[PDB]
Amino acid sequence: PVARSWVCRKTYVTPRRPFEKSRLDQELKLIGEYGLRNKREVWRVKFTLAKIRKAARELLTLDEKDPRRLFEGNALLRRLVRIGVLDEGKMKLDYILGLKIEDFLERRLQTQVFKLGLAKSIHHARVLIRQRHIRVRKQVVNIPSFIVRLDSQKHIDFSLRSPYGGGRPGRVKRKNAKK
Amino acid sequence: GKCRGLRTARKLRSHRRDQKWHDKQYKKAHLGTALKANPFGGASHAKGIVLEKVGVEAKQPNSAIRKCVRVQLIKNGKKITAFVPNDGCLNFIEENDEVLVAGFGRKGHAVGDIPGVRFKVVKVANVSLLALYKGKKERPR
Amino acid sequence: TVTIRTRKFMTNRLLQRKQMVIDVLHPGKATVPKTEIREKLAKMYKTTPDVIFVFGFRTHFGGGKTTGFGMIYDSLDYAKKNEPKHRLARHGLYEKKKTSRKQRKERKNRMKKVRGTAKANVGAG
Amino acid sequence: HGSLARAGKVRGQTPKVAKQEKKKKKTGRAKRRMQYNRRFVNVVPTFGKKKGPNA
RNA sequence: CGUGCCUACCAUGGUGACCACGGGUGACGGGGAAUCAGGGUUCGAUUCCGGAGAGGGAGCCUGAGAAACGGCUACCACAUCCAAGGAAGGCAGCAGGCGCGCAAAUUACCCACUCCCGACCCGGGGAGGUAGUGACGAAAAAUAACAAUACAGGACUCUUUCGAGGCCCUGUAAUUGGAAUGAGUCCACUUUAAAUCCUUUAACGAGGAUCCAUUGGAGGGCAAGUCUGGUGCCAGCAGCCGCG
Ligand SMILES: [Mg+2]
Ligand SMILES: [Mg+2]
Ligand SMILES: [Mg+2]
Ligand SMILES: [Mg+2]
Ligand SMILES: [Mg+2]
Ligand SMILES: [Mg+2]
Ligand SMILES: [Mg+2]
Ligand SMILES: [Mg+2]
Ligand SMILES: [Mg+2]
Ligand SMILES: [Mg+2]
Ligand SMILES: [Mg+2]
Ligand SMILES: [Mg+2]
Ligand SMILES: [Mg+2]
């Protein structure tokens, strides 16, 4: 029969209690602080952090001199450093569990724009990274949920666009009105 | 109390397999009388035919005349008194209409206000009661 | 204006052909069509343009690069021999003239029902 | 014996009210931005005993 | 071919409370799937492997391989033509039609990719791939957004300030631009067997008549009104407690 692809992954934390007052206040102040749309993209970050914590507890269960533990722990530390959550300091597995929620939202696309300029009100920075106006490199970035890696971390330019590139997208309307 | 030896697992599974039938949910899930005695033939929804419209009474603390429809089924062929949900809808559920029915909140028990009605009307002639109550154009008359 | 660079490059001397992966750069206007990339590759190879084929063009979401597969051939007879009719159809060498469903199958049915002279009359006419 | 004539009595006797022209609402992220600007650390003058989200 | 597979004789054996034997399964078996301590519980017809059948069920030619059914023979239940002495059939294949049911897609195109068959580079394949319906479901994700201008609700660094607002959000059917950009409208690209969709790009393309976001609720659980008008244990609401 057919053979193309069959897979299903749900990057989605579903809470047990639906209506917790402190948890709704925490998630909405998280959204209003870090510039998000809905709570499913909070639950994205919560699911990634939960999966990393599951892998970290599975590694900390094993013996210290285990080669599988050494390989998977060095790989997890390398991936978290290349994301940029960790530093070049504490390379222990307990500090991975010591990580918090807001670090991944800090390493996402909009907060790096906040830390390295051309932000101008994060709610407008969402529009600036949605519309083609903020471009990590020659492969054009469109989607706001973009984990900015530490390996480049600074290439925020844009070419052939409205404010510095050029062209008359809708100022030709005003020019034809004045002419 | 229990039996905690290394070769007692047959006695354990025999005891659990015997004492598991005394739960209500296990025996109603794995006994055939909840297929050969219930309506729907073990289904979730079912179409039916309006037979008559019956005004039943409420319970003892409440005081209301609930409006229900005795429904002649299509799949099994039994008779089900199904409830008319909303404020109106008695004038929207007429005689000989294609009527889809479901549960209230539980197949076993009923609602604590209506004595002997286990099921609830959703559709009238492929048009829902929400549509007949608000929004949509007009009945399929 | 445009810049065409070949990244991967192989030479099949058995069939007298050369395979390559072509990246066309776009800091400017739209995707350059089938003819002009072929003509620029013919200018960079400095032979007759009527022998080089190319197929496939992606686009990396705003300017950037477009990636395809190019085939430089050294003989037009080898190009007519080793290539399928659908890639000859870009230049119009092969013509089938009956690209229709159920025609061949109804001819099979008319050749399956009757047999012999009536079959040569009906199924072939 | 229970009569079926009183069907939709309150739905019939309810006086109809024309829905007045309310302006358009905000989007998903804009509504969350309005919630964060309204019901959080932006404006909180009073003491943390009573709550006033609707009155 | 090794066999109680079958036959003639001889012996009376073999299984079972460590559940055989006899029934039911809404029972094809697995690799797997759902469920978040561990342990478990429930499905697995479904794309892979192996088995079984081509309406029920028996027999057989050919063939290395069949008890084959897009092979045949006879019976039963269906069922087409009939000029009434006879012919002809098996969609649990692909589309589609009837019935059934809560319930499930178009009489589309191509061997272009992967394989397969045949004498064979060349033909064929509803195997497959592409296209249409599709809110089973999974991922990313506009719906009016944004920076400023001005009144004030002012929480607030600060001096008797009834303000210096080089921190600020909000009601502004208030102005202002970037006239941002997207969906759509379409040329030329490109993908592609021919096309469509994805992306590139030329030109139109927002100011509350916009290009309108709905689904449920506001006594507790369970986030949110002791607001207004009718109904007056009637209608009804409420999955339980309860209200009228
Ligand atoms: Mg109940
Ligand atoms: Mg079965
Ligand atoms: Mg689990
Ligand atoms: Mg488990
Ligand atoms: Mg076997
Ligand atoms: Mg068979
Ligand atoms: Mg059949
Ligand atoms: Mg077959
Ligand atoms: Mg068949
Ligand atoms: Mg109300
Ligand atoms: Mg509450
Ligand atoms: Mg209500
Ligand atoms: Mg409810």
Separation of CA B23 and ligand 6 centre (Å): 46
Please tell me the distance from the alpha carbon of residue C115 to that of residue C125, in angstroms, as a whole number.
14
User: Do the Cβ atoms of B67 and D4 come within 8 Å?
Assistant: yes
Q: Which residues pair with B46 in a beta bridge?
A: B101
- Tell me whether residues A29 and D28 touch, CB distance under 8 A: no
Query: With contact defined as beta carbons under 8 Å apart, do B67 and B84 qualify?
Result: yes
Q: Angle D28-38/A21-34 helices, nearest 10 degrees?
A: 110
In units of Å, what resolution does this entry have?
3.5
Distance of CA C29 to the CA centre of its chain: 25
Task: State the smallest CA–CA distance between residue B55 and chain D in angstroms.
Answer: 6
Task: Please give the method by which this entry was determined.
Answer: cryo-EM
Per the listing, tokens 């600036």 go with A128
- Burial per residue of A104-135, b for 16 or more beta-carbon CB atoms within 10 angstroms, e otherwise: bbbbbbbbbbbeeeebeebeebbebbeebbbb
Chain A residue with CA closest to C61: the answer is A140
Contact criterion met (CB < 8 Å) for B55 and D11: no
The strands making up C3-12's β-sheet, listed across from edge to edge, are: C3-12, C17-26, C64-73, C53-55
Contact A125, A146 (CB under 8 A): no
Strand C53-55 and strand C17-26: the pairing is unpaired
b/e for C8-39, b at 16 or more Cβ within 10 A?
eeeeeeeeebbebebbbebeeeeebeeeebbe
A96 contacts A90 by C-beta, under 8 angstroms? no
* A33: closest CA of chain D, how far (Å): 8
